[PDB]
Amino acid sequence: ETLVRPKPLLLKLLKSVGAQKDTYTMKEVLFYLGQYIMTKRLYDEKQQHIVYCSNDLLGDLFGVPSFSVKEHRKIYTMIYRNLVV
């Protein structure tokens, strides 16, 4: 995918789930975001499309308390504010 440089608080989040680089592909960023959502249990297994990120750094970065994984455009918009290409 395309090469992006996460801003400092997104880099911290990614490194907290074992990412090792300063520069990533978008596919890597999405992967590590998912690992973070899992390790912080920001979802309920019986409605797995919903992310609950209020009161978490993820919600601070994204600007929302919750979102659905089906909001493709909105998720990219929220991620891109935390990255430079």
Binding site: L30, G34, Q35, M38, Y43, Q48, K70
Partner: peptide, 7 residues
Amino acid sequence: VWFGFXX
């Protein structure tokens, strides 16, 4: 779209 994530 399963978090353990990305199509």
